[PDB]
């Protein structure tokens, strides 16, 4: 029971392929009690969440909706019971419009699209922390999902810029979370899975993603989300108690090897 | 004549203390022909720019105005003459509303404010490169101003997030600029220069810089930073792009 | 039982304050079966190791002794039993002579001293991996102790150079270890604990750590670091290799 | 005249292909007065150095020879004249025995070989600074050659570890050099140029080296040392006056791009 008795909020479950779905599954298997969120279409999200090992309250959260943010802590408290607080929070919501990510030239993304992406992918990490830290226990852990943006790459374009901004936001969130005895960290995952993108972009992406398994000293299996879900659970646990403002790489070691 | 015969656009001149003012001054001393940009307060900008060593056209540019951007190359070409292109572009226009930077708690910055800051401080780097690459010469150089955002610091708050975003933007700009034979780099400067708390915090931050810097850091002197930018505008760093050059007295290399 | 059924070799236990002592303690509490190494002073080492929660074989290992290295796997196999392999290896053996670390000016360290330090602190990481990989199980984990050398600091001097070298070594070890399904990672710890100058310098360094760390840093408590090592020894970081995990209270993420 | 009137010591000239040869050539073209060093075989090194644009004293320097180090400043002073000091020093000596670099497995390099490599490639940066800082002018510049060791790579093996150690040494040298108003920096160059290595290693190296031109947004021409020589001259000049303990990349921007 790695997370026995811990209460964890998990955002970002959209399908049973979502990385958040696997995080939730592994966390329940390890004894956690979960609270889940969804932006919209909650009857649809409930159908997916019913397939987790155990029941979990589902709460509405559109991170661009100020009222949802303002009521969130109260609604969680009602879900988990007065006097109870959260031990963990998982942010697995990243979004960039297609104009900012994919086939579109980098210069052709209008700022309104980039700003929406940054709002959902990076600013919301702070918004969630603001809402939830007042109901988190000392020793608790906020974990966000990242994809290493240290170097530019084809196609990821402004989503890479959004991840760069998330990395910086995480460092500031850690300062605020520290006042509660709470850690804030990101997990930088390898790619988890182009005909839709067309031939050029699809080949470029496939090369990019396959370099990962080539570089990773222990390999990288893009079809298996479990190693990333386990890492997140490690950070949610008591076993990384001195790590905050940081990035943990769940990428097969690929980012440490040039070729 | 480090920049003899180069035509260079310089944004961000607001006072004669602005870093862009010194960059302009030094570039003119080294033989560059400049074009300057401003948003609004053009009478006040003209008075300042009159203190530079040589004349330079002033053009209007609000980076949030899509029409300014869409007309900018044409307006630059008219200023420098048809058949002439730019060799350099300097982006020195960072901004964050006070809700995102200073005394305001990090969590109390609304997104509208942050988004404005990121627009002006980071996205505009890309917008200016989109507008100006088609009128730049091969061997040219685009340089933006940074303040190392690798670690969180008190008070700089969301402006540090904006500089993180700018660093990422620079790497993508480099890819685009490369197609024109143009380099894109940032210069990460040391600090150049209320209430008791914020004032003490900022003073401690600024004092630690000179302490850590192996060659010292003089916050009152922008010249070393201006020289560094002119180095990146020259032909002497011809294989450096998508990158960050630190003009900070080596402070970022030292722990204590 | 985080490490239930795992067999783990732990080097570097010298006193009951040693970080390796706590790593051993915590790993035993979490169900691991340990093998311990020491060089010399074995009577003194046995007394310390008797204070651990459970018994563990002690083996001789001077990492500069090629014969110890060449016999080490066989000696480990004899200790754990034929048909059993290791799941984990902990390297906690840094050393630099005083000429390279402390009060001595950086330039006054002779190379013979530095080279000894690098041998023990960095090369031995590779030597131990060479010796022990052939008797490790897939899914295993090799962990070494680091102290973030990304920036220069007073007094740590050539020991910081040695840790830089160790970080590079770790990335190459990872490549080799991968062929066996084994991970290789370092844990960069915060400081765990003469004359006036050196004493003040070291105190300032140590005090700044707790100030910068968003969750604080208690230099008197090795447990958080020991837990982190045990996390890397477990099955819960199964995709992390060639890497550095910081157990420093987040201090390295914060400027002031 | 970028370096007009500057006195610069340049180590590492072995052939007219050496990067130090190009640095020296470009520095002379820009008005510098040079002092050159060689380990051994000075009549041979003189033949190469005679092909530079201008005459330059050649002094003996084996960086593993303590006596050479102890006499070096005096011998330079005699070469450049009493009262004169150096404005610049270029360290372009890197060496690793074949057991540490190339075909040999990483684990098969004996420490005696690794230590010799680290002595020549990394410790000597400090030894040279120790000898020469007492005869360097404020505003001066010590520059070493680097090859980015942030990530592991095939074949470079322990030479990458030596460069990692050099990077750390540079940060400490900068502290000491700062007391004289002198800067210390490294230039991380792209690869400048496998049948000898055999088929596997030769293919691996060729792929590694060719990825560079693919990733570099402005390209990378491995046959042209001039862009690297110019960068070094930039750091030797007055135009990077606030940069120390640092690494400047002359690599076509390759290290900033993933694919």
Nearest to B177 among D217, D219, D242 (CB): D217
Neighbours of chain A (3+ CB pairs under 8 A): B, C, D
Nearest to A172 among B111, B157, B172 (CB): B157
| Chain gaps in chain D, named by the residue before each (C–N > 2.5 Å) | 193
Distance (Å) from the alpha carbon of A152 to chain D's nearest alpha carbon: 5
B-chain residue closest to C148, CA distance: B255
Is residue D165 less than 8 Å (CB to CB) from chain A? no
List, as residue ranges, the binding site of A: 18-19, 62-63, 93-94, 156, 163, 192
* Secondary structure (3-state) at B124: helix
Distance (Å) from the alpha carbon of B139 to chain C's nearest alpha carbon: 33
DSSP secondary-structure letter at A141? E
Q: What pairs with residue A183 in β-bridges?
A: A141
First to last CA, chain B: 39
Q: Two tokens at C30? A: 């979490």
Q: Which of C164, C169, C184 to mutate to test binding with chain D, by most D CBs within 10 Å of its CB? A: C164
Q: Entry resolution in angstroms?
A: 1.8
Question: Are residues C205 and B255, on separate chains, in Cβ contact within 8 Å?
Answer: yes
In the block, residue with structure tokens 């060791």: D149
Is residue A152 less than 8 Å (CB to CB) from chain D? yes
DSSP secondary-structure letter at D190? P
Which CATH fold topology does A1-259 show?
A: Rossmann fold (3.40.50)
Is residue B62 less than 8 Å (CB to CB) from chain A? no
Q: Are the beta carbons of C56 and C35 closer than 8 angstroms?
A: yes
Q: How was this structure determined?
A: X-ray
Q: Two tokens at B5? A: 């015969």
Phi, psi of B83, deg, nearest 5: 90, -5
Distance from C-alpha of A250 to C-alpha of A253, rounded to nearest angstrom: 7
Q: Look at residues C46, C80, C81 and name the one whose alpha carbon lies nearest to residue C60.
A: C46
C-chain residue closest to B152, CA distance: C254
DSSP run (H or E) holding B35: strand B33-38
Is residue C151 less than 8 Å (CB to CB) from chain B? yes
Strands (E), B105-206: 136-146, 183-189
D-chain residue closest to A256, CA distance: D151
Is residue D123 less than 8 Å (CB to CB) from chain C? yes
Distance (Å) from the alpha carbon of B95 to chain D's nearest alpha carbon: 24
Question: Are residues D151 and A258, on separate chains, in Cβ contact within 8 Å?
Answer: yes
Rg (CA), chain C: 18
Q: Look at residues B6, B16, B247 and name the one whose alpha carbon lies nearest to residue B139.
A: B6
Is residue B254 less than 8 Å (CB to CB) from chain A? no
Phi, psi of D4, deg, nearest 5: -55, 130
CB pairs under 8 A between A and D: 32
Is residue D153 less than 8 Å (CB to CB) from chain A? yes
Q: Is C19 annotated as a binding residue?
A: yes
Q: What is the arrangement of strands in the sheet containing B86-91, beginning at the earlier edge strand?
A: B58-60, B33-38, B7-10, B86-91, B136-146, B183-189, B243-247
Distance (Å) from the alpha carbon of B39 to chain A's nearest alpha carbon: 19
Distance from C-alpha of D207 to C-alpha of C22, rounded to nearest angstrom: 45
DSSP secondary-structure letter at B87? E
Is residue C119 less than 8 Å (CB to CB) from chain A? no
Chain D positions in Cβ-Cβ contact with residue A255 (cut-off 8 Å): 151
In the block, residue with structure tokens 């009577």: C43
Is residue A178 less than 8 Å (CB to CB) from chain B? no
Distance from C-alpha of B55 to C-alpha of C9, rounded to nearest angstrom: 73
Q: Are the beta carbons of C122 and C162 closer than 8 angstroms?
A: yes
Question: Are residues A152 and D258, on separate chains, in Cβ contact within 8 Å?
Answer: yes
Question: Are residues A107 and B129, on separate chains, in Cβ contact within 8 Å?
Answer: yes
Question: For the structural domain made of C1-256, what CATH number should be given?
Answer: 3.40.50.720
Distance from C-alpha of A115 to C-alpha of A113, rounded to nearest angstrom: 5
How far is residue B176 CA from its own chain's centroid?
19
DSSP run (H or E) holding B47: helix B42-49
Chain C positions in Cβ-Cβ contact with residue B253 (cut-off 8 Å): 151-152
CB pairs under 8 A between C and D: 81
Nearest to A248 among C216, C234, C240 (CB): C240
Q: Is B62 annotated as a binding residue?
A: yes
Distance (Å) from the alpha carbon of A13 to chain C's nearest alpha carbon: 22
Q: What is the DSSP string of A44-93?
A: HHHHHHTTSSS---EEE--TT-HHHHHHHHHHHHHHH-TT--EEEEEE--
Nearest to D2 among B174, B236, B246 (CB): B236
Q: Look at residues D229, D193, D194 and name the one whose alpha carbon lies nearest to residue D213.
A: D193
Question: Are residues C215 and A242, on separate chains, in Cβ contact within 8 Å?
Answer: yes
In the block, residue with structure tokens 């990384």: A240
Chain B positions in Cβ-Cβ contact with residue D243 (cut-off 8 Å): 228, 245-248, 250
Q: Which residues of D23-36 are buried (b: 16+ CB within 10 A; e: fewer)?
A: bbbbbbbbebbbbb
Sign of the C-alpha dihedral computed for residues B34, B35, B39 and B45 taken in this order? positive
Inter-CA distances, B241 with B2, B228, B232, D26, Å: 19, 15, 10, 21
Query: Considering only residues 180 to 239 of chain D, which have any Cβ-Cβ distance to chain C shorter than 8 Å?
Result: none
Is residue A97 less than 8 Å (CB to CB) from chain C? no
**How many CA atoms lie less than 13 Å away from C94 in the CB half-sphere?**
25
Distance (Å) from the alpha carbon of A1 to chain B's nearest alpha carbon: 34
**How many CA atoms lie less than 13 Å away from A85 in the CB half-sphere?**
14
Is residue D62 less than 8 Å (CB to CB) from chain C? no
Q: Two tokens at D30? A: 């820009």
Chain B positions in Cβ-Cβ contact with residue D248 (cut-off 8 Å): 237, 240, 245
Strands (E), chain C: 7-10, 33-38, 58-60, 86-91, 136-146, 183-189, 243-247
Inter-CA distances, C88 with A219, B114, C19, C22, Å: 19, 47, 16, 16
Chain A positions in Cβ-Cβ contact with residue B171 (cut-off 8 Å): 151-152
Q: Are the beta carbons of B214 and D245 closer than 8 angstroms?
A: yes
């Amino acid at each position: 029971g790695l997370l026995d008795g811990k209460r964890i909020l998990v955002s970002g479950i959209i399908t049973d392929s979502s990385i958040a779905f696997h995080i939730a599954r592994v966390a329940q298997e390890q004894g956690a009690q979960l609270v889940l969120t969804g932006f919209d279409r909650l009857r649809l999200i409930q159908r997916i969440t019913d397939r987790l090992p155990a029941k979990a309250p589902l709460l509405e959260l559109d991170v661009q909706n100020e009222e949802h943010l303002a009521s969130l802590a109260g609604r969680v408290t009602e879900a988990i019971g007065a006097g109870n607080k959260l031990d963990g929070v998982v942010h697995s919501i990243g979004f960039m419009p297609q104009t900012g990510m994919g086939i579109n030239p980098f210069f052709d993304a209008p700022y309104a699209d980039v700003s929406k992406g940054i709002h959902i992918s990076a600013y919301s990490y702070a918004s969630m922390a603001k809402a939830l830290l007042p109901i988190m226990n000392p020793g608790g852990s906020i974990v966000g999902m990242d994809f290493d943006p240290s170097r530019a790459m084809p196609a990821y374009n402004w989503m890479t810029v959004a991840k760069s901004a998330l990395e910086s936001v995480n460092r500031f969130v850690a300062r605020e979370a520290g006042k509660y005895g709470v850690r804030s960290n990101l997990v930088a995952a390898g790619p988890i899975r182009g005909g839709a993108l067309g031939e050029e972009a699809g080949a470029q992406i496939q090369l990019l993603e396959e370099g990962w398994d080539q570089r990773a000293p222990i390999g990288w299996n893009m079809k298996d989300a479990t190693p990333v879900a386990k890492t997140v659970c490690a950070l949610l646990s008591d076993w990384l108690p001195a790590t905050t403002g940081d990035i943990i790489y769940a990428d097969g070691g690929a980012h440490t090897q040039l070729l």
